[PDB]
Design a protein around this ligand. Structure first.
Ligand SMILES: Cc1ncc(COP(=O)(O)O)c(CNOCC(=O)O)c1O
Ligand SMILES: Cc1ncc(COP(=O)(O)O)c(CNOCC(=O)O)c1O
Lengths: 437, 473, 437, 473
């Protein structure tokens, strides 16, 4: 089936009007050899049948709702009010707002997104969004290196391994060098920063869930004329002192925790907050307040010399399509909750995580790893292989024990809890874990 | 006039209440780690929240409300079916046991198979988050290819046509490559002579869209491929204009080594006011080992995420890709099938050519007009600037096509109607374009007049940028 | 939890302004004895917990997607495009369009619905919507009795037993008389219509699914001075000759078959169509095209003297709130498929039902009951108690065999097929029936 | 201007295609039954369908976009949560094995218990489709009761206040009863003296709302009940104004024998442009045996639909009730709980009482202003028409309150803000009503000006009504 409106009579008329003999004739000027390719695709299906197939595939999976898996993504409540609003056709089907007069909706909404992100991180400005947390970190670091003119980067091993991997790719691509600061006792020790270092990177809470002490890292970075880059979970900023208050110059993170569906890893969005004084190095789209010819308030994309259309080769980034819709979902979430509501959600997930930690400590052979204080995620040492444990757990109907790569230690597994978890879910998980062990 | 969400706030007002018994912060985290000053987030009730965003959506237009003939964007209908399809896989965790995510992995694998079948590639990654991300991925792959052959120090430049999109040359820089721009011939296609002059042991790759950004198909593409092959230059395919040839021709059969596609363009994934998207990257077998990890493979037990790839460029983003968007695209293909996609490309081309005919009849010009494909580039008659006509169109309830791009045509009007727009819609659009020429210069220069806002002070926004409600710094 | 915006300081101020000392003081003038009622309700729950409880309830049910159950409601495809459109806040949260200047969306959509229903019925006008099929019929007959000035009604037993029961309640309420025409061989024989009869009612397809010959019924009614009321499934009207073509004066039906979620019985909508000549007696809202002060096309509610506000005790009906949103979902469906798309859907369902009819007849002991030609439903004579069969079929994961009351015969059960039923579904069901028998 | 769906139509154009192999009619249906002429349904593609309806919605306002202070309608916020709640039970068939529908039946039971708890009734039917449908159900119940006691021939009149909603008397007629109106006293409450002269063995019932439609609580309600009960007259409670007292007072403790609730008013079920809705009817035990069938009960086996009620009045609508709306009301009550509902009622009263003060200070009058409850009735200062102020409001971006009802107040402005509206919104509204009194007479009479359409020609629509696009007959 299809979405084409054309009737046969209309195609004949249009065909004659453009001097074409048939649909096939429209491609007659292409090299004879590349035509009639042997493409093998399954036969077209009506929409109800496509849905039947989707549902069959979905029926093969075990839903992760109320899962205890962590490592960057967690099962947080996805408010229907937010999803209902982001489903509005105007937001869903609009393109990048290049004609501002008819795009004040998306423009103003993005300006509000920027304000909320900047506030959440304790910083001054923020772009319209990035693909995700990892790429946001890579761009944030590239910014610091362009701003300082240096090529050296120090990254705590506490930064999610995938983030560090993405960072390395972007870094080595432009000739920059990265040095990884390993964790000691779950936390990252204060390093000595040389003058070849343009950026110091630390995540809080870190990969293993440990709260890190950012202050001294910022002072250590500045002392050497290096910029401090903070990787932080946005939901956590609802209760933890933000990097901005620690002296951080750049803050990045993934927006999944702001009520976004897990979606097996995407899409979500990344945020990049910084000082207004670094606006010239800021990559991506930026909305500014302004006024129209009649004196009315308006919003528009600004300082576009930082982007690809105008600067092309010298653009601060090649990023064109960003992650606007999901960033708006985050903004709606932040707005729906307010400062106190956000703090409530964050504290609740932290509370349940701690209760779970306390419960899991009673399981035979289980030993703690992540040190206190930790946030809403923590790693434990298991008496069996973490992948084997996650699998056995799934066989009993539970989603937990997310395997921590060995670079952190042996048999490590992460566990998370959120505002939608209750006492009974924690006990049920522990019993399941005791059975598998 | 419309208030900011921040102006709607009222001190202490609550919206969502997701916690029954809120714990005391000091019982959970140490004092010195606690935020002292709350972020200045809005404080509104749910009704206010709904009215705000619903009010904003009503001050916005999209494909759902207006004809969007934006060249290089493929603003085609985004079927509502796909939104329902996506909500079906909302509750999946990327780190959950693979044996419990077979439905999802299977979908990822199948999509990759369909995209390779339509593109002629041998391997594929669905990880990159957008077209430009796919470009960075493909170029880094090409770079890893040369380096693995001891030419990583000589292969230093990337070639792009003067009609290339800004992201092409921008990507070269992100990949640490130098970039040289080759001029187009008198027909708007690639200038072979200028190309043969640039090709050499120093060129890492040639980035091209086919059809090109003028909406023209590169008739000497096979020749261009041959020249690249002998010089050892990798031929990169920007899939922005894939909609023009879906199911009729494959870049792989044209000689392209690497390919990237835009699901949020060609495959109906919604534009969402800027994003998010998906930029899959397909490659020929000799570039396959350098693909970013992980790849979805079909094994014995079932499907799995393959990380065992020693020559991999690494990771371009977190997790495995924007899965929910992959669902949209899978749905589209399984719905249209091969015949459906071919018909879509043919009509996408017919709408573009037919509309090209209507605008020329109205007095508009097309400097480069061989058989126009999915889009075309017109210019208004001498004396009219595209900017003003665009604003005039806004006043008339239409949305202008893309303007001032490609960069090689003054007052460029890049028009891409896509296959989902009706005949009568193209005609109404052409009529509006013809009428604007019969409007006085002053009227055009002061348009729009009825839109929620009129022309904005672009100057003030660049000299005194107010980037947040609090304008800190 | 709640949706109240008031902060304590605002309540404080407002309380002072109206001269109340507290929230409870606002009810101080109520008699002291009825105050403080001890009401027992469960403790409040956050939205995610409410959804969780709804989920636990939903998990207790065996979804009826693709069921073979018939009898008024059937499992048809519910097109997401329609649901997405009917979900727009403006349509969902608007009230009856009494201030037309800002309600042209609902007023026009309603005008288009009236048009589509009238067309489908082969008649001239239709109101804004009735609560449902049964209620539309009751109102339709009452309309005819008011128009003819008579008190007698003849209703075919082929009319859904529930519609007849509702019809009876309404009819006896006003002193009207109702006579039932027993079905013979699964069809209703042409009756002799006296002059006391103001309405002759027949359903097509009928309750048992059999196609009825409407021509001679309209003539038998008209020859006696009575009006002919036809009950018809809207989807069927996409392929079957409309009652208006047979000379029916009034047509009614339930709109569930027009892509509406079954929702365990409600809500859906009912439609009432008739001749422009009987408009004065039509109950419910009516939209008319008109023009504005400058000559712009507009839509407004009209001939309101037929309704309760203006006519009160002499109103044609007490109906205020109708079934506007679902009727609009019906209009969207009708527009989405068009005449051909609707015809195809009706045909596919008829095709699959017949294929199913033949298949079930092979099961030993299964004998036919509904005669040919039947539509997308048919009743069979089973060797076991219908309810027992439905239960047995349900324990095997199949929804089928909807029991037919004994008034029609013994051990009868209805089966239905729709456009989303495929060959394999029919076979799997037959096998199951073979097993339970 | 905005086109009709029929005008967007194009001969032969297709939209949704749900059938792969469409069978030929001749093979399934006999020639004489086949429709000869296709219905003139619109022929539009999906994109067109979406633009049409998305466009119509943008030419509409609702609680989601605007403050709707409509008295007697309770236009409170409709939580989006409830839409997601109803989606969970979309695929259930009314006739599937009850052993497989225990989740739905349990929900129906629980909702019934909650409603009986809030109203003080002993038994309840969730069947009726709307408030007016509930009235008919309740009035037939009272009739079955009188006829069962042998007074069916003498109990022939229904009493209603002069301030009653038109459906009340209309309902009496649908039920074969005569209706007599009793005037209100000087305070806007029931005239006990006029009531005593009407009460007698010929009166079947007295229909009342409490608070009444003036927003005033009937302070002598217990005496009214005593008088009624003494004459053997059944007291019917129209629940239109339940939002004013839920959690604070129960009609059942006031002396009411039968009650009907409007889920689409008091309990957040959306108004959907007029419908659909739900009108549950609760009753005291003595009237329970006449309740329409079936009733949800919980037995040894589990929850079930009980049809064994020999004295039932029968069936008033198909199946068991608007289940999907019941899911929404259940959700609402399970979210707020008793204290949440009590808070809603109090703030609904506070909002009305506060806005009332604001309006009186702007020069508006309240002919009956005892302690105002969830709504109040005002009238403009001498010389102004409610209609003109209503239109003026529209021009100002607000929605007017209910106008010209109740019928006992000239130029009535029936205002009900509900609990979900904010203090600043109430104030902006009053500020608007105030400014309209300062606008010149000719300005108000010709309002609105900026709306999609200005004042419509009612006379034309009534003298020359065009009921369909085809205007046949
Ligand atoms: C020819 C061409 N190639 C790539 C892209 C970028 O893909 P995304 O990163 O946007 O998915 C485009 C898009 N150009 O639009 C740029 C703008 O100014 O909006 C393209 O046309
Ligand atoms: C006091 C009062 N009683 C009954 C009704 C009707 O209930 P539904 O059947 O609408 O649920 C109402 C509603 N009146 O609105 C009248 C109108 O013309 O819109 C009521 O206020």
């Amino acid at each position: 089936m299809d979405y084409t409106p054309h009737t046969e009579e209309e195609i004949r008329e249009m065909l004659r009007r453009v001097g074409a003999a048939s649909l096939e004739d429209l491609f007659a000027h292409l090299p004879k050899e590349i035509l009639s390719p042997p493409i093998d695709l399954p036969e077209p299906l009506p929409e109800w049948k496509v849905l039947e197939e989707l549902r069959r595939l979905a029926a093969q999976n075990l839903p992760a709702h109320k899962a205890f898996l962590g490592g960057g993504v967690r099962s947080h409540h996805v408010p229907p009010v937010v999803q209902a609003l982001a489903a509005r056709g105007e937001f869903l089907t609009a393109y990048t707002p290049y004609q501002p007069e008819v795009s004040q909706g998306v423009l103003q909404a993005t300006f509000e997104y920027q304000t909320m992100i900047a506030e959440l991180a304790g910083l001054e400005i923020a772009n319209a969004s990035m693909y995700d947390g990892a790429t946001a970190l890579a761009e944030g670091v590239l910014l610091a290196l362009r701003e300082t003119g240096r090529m050296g980067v120090l990254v705590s091993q506490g930064v999610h391994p995938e983030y560090r991997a993405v960072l390395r790719a972007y870094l080595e691509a432009v000739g920059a060098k990265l040095l990884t600061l390993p964790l000691e006792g779950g936390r990252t020790p204060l390093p000595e920063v040389g003058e070849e270092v343009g950026a110091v990177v630390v995540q809080n809470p870190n990969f293993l869930g440990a709260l890190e002490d950012l202050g001294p890292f910022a002072e250590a970075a500045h002392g050497a004329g290096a910029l401090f880059v903070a990787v932080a979970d946005p939901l956590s900023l609802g209760v933890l002192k933000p990097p901005g208050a620690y002296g951080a110059d750049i803050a990045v993170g993934d927006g999944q925790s702001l009520g976004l569906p897990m979606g097996f890893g995407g899409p979500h969005f990344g945020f990049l907050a910084t000082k207004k004084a670094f606006v010239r190095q800021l990559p991506g789209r930026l909305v500014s307040e302004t006024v129209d010819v009649e004196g009315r308030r308006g919003f528009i994309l600004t300082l576009q010399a930082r982007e690809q259309y105008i600067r092309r080769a010298k653009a601060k980034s090649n990023i064109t399509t960003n992650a606007q819709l999901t960033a708006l979902m985050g903004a709606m979430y932040l707005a729906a909750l307010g400062p106190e509501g956000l703090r409530e959600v964050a504290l609740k997930s932290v509370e349940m995580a701690h209760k779970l930690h306390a419960l899991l400590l009673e399981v035979p052979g289980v030993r703690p790893f992540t040190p206190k204080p930790f946030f809403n995620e923590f790693a434990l040492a298991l008496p069996k292989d973490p992948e084997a444990v996650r699998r056995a757990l799934a066989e009993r109907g539970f989603h937990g024990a997310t395997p921590v790569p060995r670079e952190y230690g042996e048999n490590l597994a992460l566990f998370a809890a959120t505002e939608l978890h209750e006492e009974e879910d924690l006990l049920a998980l522990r019993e399941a874990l005791k059975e598998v062990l | 006039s419309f208030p900011l969400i921040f102006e709607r706030s009222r001190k202490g007002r609550r919206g969502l209440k997701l916690v029954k018994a809120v714990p005391k912060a000091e019982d959970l985290i140490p004092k010195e780690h606690l935020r002292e000053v709350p972020p200045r987030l809005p404080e509104v009730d749910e009704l206010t929240l709904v009215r705000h965003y619903t009010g904003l959506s009503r001050r916005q237009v999209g494909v759902d409300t207006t004809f969007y003939p934006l060249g290089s964007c493929t603003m085609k209908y985004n079927p509502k079916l796909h939104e329902e399809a996506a909500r079906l896989f909302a509750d999946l965790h990327p780190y959950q046991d693979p044996r419990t995510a077979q439905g999802a992995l299977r979908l990822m694998w199948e999509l990759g198979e369909y995209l390779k079948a339509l593109t002629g590639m041998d391997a594929i990654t669905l990880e990159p988050a957008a077209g430009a991300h796919g470009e960075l991925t493909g170029i880094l792959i090409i770079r890893a290819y040369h380096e693995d052959r001891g030419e990583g120090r000589t292969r230093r430049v990337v070639l792009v046509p003067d009609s290339a999109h800004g992201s092409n040359p921008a990507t070269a820089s992100m990949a640490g490559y130098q970039v040289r721009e080759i001029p187009s011939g008198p027909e708007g296609e690639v200038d072979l002579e200028a190309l043969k002059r640039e090709l050499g042991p120093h060129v890492a790759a040639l980035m091209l869209t086919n059809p090109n950004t003028l909406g023209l198909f590169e008739r000497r593409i096979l020749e261009i491929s041959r020249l690249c092959k002998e010089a050892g230059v990798q031929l990169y395919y920007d899939g922005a204009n894939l909609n023009a040839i879906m199911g009729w021709a494959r870049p792989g059969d044209m000689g392209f080594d690497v390919v990237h596609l835009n699901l949020h363009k060609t495959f109906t994934v919604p534009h969402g006011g800027g994003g998010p998207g998906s930029g899959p990257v397909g490659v020929k077998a000799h570039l396959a080992p350098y693909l970013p990890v992980p790849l979805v493979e079909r094994g014995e037990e079932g499907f799995y995420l393959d990380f065992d790839r020693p020559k991999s460029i690494g990771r371009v983003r977190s997790f495995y890709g924007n899965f929910l968007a992959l669902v949209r695209a899978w749905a589209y293909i399984r719905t249209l099938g091969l015949e459906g996609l071919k018909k879509a490309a043919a009509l996408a081309v017919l709408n573009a050519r037919y509309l090209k005919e209507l605008l020329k009849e109205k007095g508009y010009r097309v400097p480069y007009d061989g058989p126009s494909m999915h889009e075309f580039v017109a210019q208004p008659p001498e004396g009219f600037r595209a900017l003003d006509l665009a604003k005039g169109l806004l006043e008339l309830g239409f949305h202008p096509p893309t303007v001032y791009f490609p960069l090689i045509v003054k007052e460029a009007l890049m028009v891409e109607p896509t296959e989902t727009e009706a005949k009568e819609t193209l005609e109404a659009f052409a009529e509006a374009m013809g009428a604007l020429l019969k409007k006085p210069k002053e009227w055009l220069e002061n348009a729009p007049y009825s839109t929620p806002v009129r022309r904005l002070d672009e100057l003030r926004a660049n000299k005194h940028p107010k980037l947040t409600y609090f304008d800190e710094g």
